[PDB]
Design a protein around this nucleic acid. Sequence first.
DNA 1: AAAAAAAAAAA
Length: 327
Amino acid sequence: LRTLNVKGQLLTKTTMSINNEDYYLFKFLVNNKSIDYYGTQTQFFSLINNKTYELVLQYSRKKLLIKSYEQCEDMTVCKSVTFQEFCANEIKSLLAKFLYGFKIYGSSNVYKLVFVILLEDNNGTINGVQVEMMSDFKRLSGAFKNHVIENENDLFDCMYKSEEKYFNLYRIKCNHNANNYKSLSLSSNSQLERLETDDSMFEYEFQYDYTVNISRSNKIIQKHRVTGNFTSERNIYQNSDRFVISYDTANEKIKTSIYNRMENAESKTDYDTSITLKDVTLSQLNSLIESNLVQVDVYLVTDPNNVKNNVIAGITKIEIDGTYEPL
DNA sequence: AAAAAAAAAAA
């Protein structure tokens, strides 16, 4: 059959079993595009992650296949980013400081990661800003280079031991919505590499101090270790339906809300059951905190000026076994 | 069929 000659960097290898047949597929980075190819078990085992290859491909059974490969060999990340590079929705490689990582409250699959980057005004000044990057479990598992994320506990463990550490963000997409909200996005070929600096880059720590979160409007995200009197009531108002929450961080009493809205494709019975399970699990949280059975972190969308529209972005339970439960 | 921030409610 006809053969295709390509060259590209491997990103991940996956095994999917469907209708009692196993398929080994490799995600390769060719010309800054993620292309999925098929292969055999020898391909699955011999090929290594994050390495370029010279591949020959045969088009068999309506599927591009890998026949032979040659292990070849081959980056620079921008230390900043401009407003216009966010406006154009460009694709960049940044140097960011990881801050927090949590599972969006009430979301089954999506996670949110908080970074500190250097934005640049048209005035030509670089300010360390706080940015949010949402993703799913699959992309987040396949994005951390040199880290094997199998289940959710591994993802949270990587998140917690990557906290306040520097990351090269390869081929991330700089979103910009209709309103002036700028976020980060994780594409198929996007990768996240942890530097393990050992504070080798410390003179720049002054630059990585934030006062504005550019993915939100005059709000930031802050992480609190609940040490005291957690409390959560539920209030169904005429329109809204929110958990009114108070708790006690080592510094401040905090008041907050978790707003509940029914999804379009969500039956009222399923929504009501899910919300009552959320309420039951929140009303048991203070009992677990007091008895030293869990340690709770709350990631909070706080307004630095007026604390009257606080919202809990996420909650994470660290259990005494070491397991992480994303409340 | 965008999605995601912002939303004290209720007189």
